[PDB]
């Protein structure tokens, strides 16, 4: 088997988990140790359903930039035995664009799902349901409900988390390594 598909399947196996909050189904990225990331609008509570069991959340941190403005990402620290494989070295130091990327989704409704969103470009400001958001990127693919939390990847790099779309385009929150230091 080739190397792009090997890395994507390895993500699914070790780092990209099926979750449910009171807002419904999401894809969750485990970054290292007991630290994961979800979209802010998933509103993780005191507990979260992960794959086949209810896991306690020890801490949640919603990320905003210096402008006080929403970045649409919540860092969760989980109460588990599991250490996630550390994938911080695949996350660029600065939010990066990409050609021919793939969005990897993993939900109970959309399990191990691969979506070819194409090129991923700087976009910046986005308005999601009256919530202003910075540091977004855009792909010209008609993403859909149930795909938030999805992992934007390409060439062994992990560059975003899907948060939105308008029926013709999709949008992720950009990743940078400093968030997971
Ligand atoms: C993922 C979450 C979901 O399924 O929620 C359903 C209860 C979706 C995926 C979107 C929907 C349509 N196509 C997609 O890719 N995301 C959302 O629904 C966004 C939720 C949200 C984000 C931030 C703050 C609050 C809520 N919202 C949107 O996609 C949206 O409201 N508008 C799209 C439009 C383009 C820029 C604004």
Q: Is 54 exposed, middle or buried (0-12, 13-18, 19+ CB in 10 A)?
A: exposed
- For residue 70, list its beta bridge partners: 64
Would you call 72 a catalytic residue per the annotation? yes
The structure was resolved experimentally with X-ray
* CA-closest candidate to residue 39, choices 140, 122, 137, 163: 163
Q: Could you tell me the resolution of this structure in angstroms?
A: 1.9
Range of the domain at 28: 16-84
Supply 147's token pair.
């795909």
Give the gyration radius of the chain's Cα atoms: 15
Burial track 56-74 (b if 16+ CB lie within 10 A, e otherwise): ebeebeeeeeeeeebbbbb
Pairing of strands 151-154, 16-21: unpaired
CA-closest candidate to residue 67, choices 133, 22, 114, 18: 133
Q: Is the CB of 170 under 6 A from ligand 1?
A: yes
Domain edge (last residue) among 59, 84, 109: 84
Nearest 5°: the CA angle 62, 153, 105 is 70
Nearest to 150 by CA among 60, 19, 5, 4: 19
The length of the chain, given as a count of residues: 181
Domain check: are 77 and 24 in the same one? yes
Ligand 1 atom closest to Cα of 149? 1
Is the CB–ligand 1 distance for residue 129 below 6 Å? yes
Q: Looking at the structure, tell me whether residues 49 and 93 fall in a common domain.
A: no
77: exposed, middle or buried (Cβ count in 10 Å: 0-12, 13-18, 19+): middle
């Amino acid at each position: 088997m080739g190397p792009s598909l090997d890395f994507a399947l390895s993500l699914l196996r070790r780092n990209v988990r099926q979750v449910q909050t009171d807002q419904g189904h999401f894809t969750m990225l485990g970054v290292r140790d007991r630290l994961a990331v979800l979209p802010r609008h998933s509103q993780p509570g005191k507990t979260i359903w992960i794959e086949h069991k209810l896991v306690n959340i020890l801490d949640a941190v919603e990320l905003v930039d210096e402008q006080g403005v929403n970045l649409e990402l919540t860092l969760i620290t989980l109460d588990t035995n599991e250490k996630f494989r550390d994938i911080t070295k695949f996350i660029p130091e600065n939010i990066s664009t990409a050609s021919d990327a793939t969005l990897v989704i993993n939900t109970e409704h959309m399990p191990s799902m691969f979506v070819p969103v194409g090129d991923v470009v700087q976009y910046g400001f986005l308005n999601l349901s009256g919530k202003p958001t910075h540091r977004t990127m855009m792909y010209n693919f008609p993403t859909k409900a149930g795909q938030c939390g999805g992992v934007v990847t390409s060439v062994g790099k992990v560059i975003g988390i899907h948060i939105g779309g308008n029926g013709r385009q999709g949008f992720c929150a950009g990743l940078k390594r400093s968030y997971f230091a």
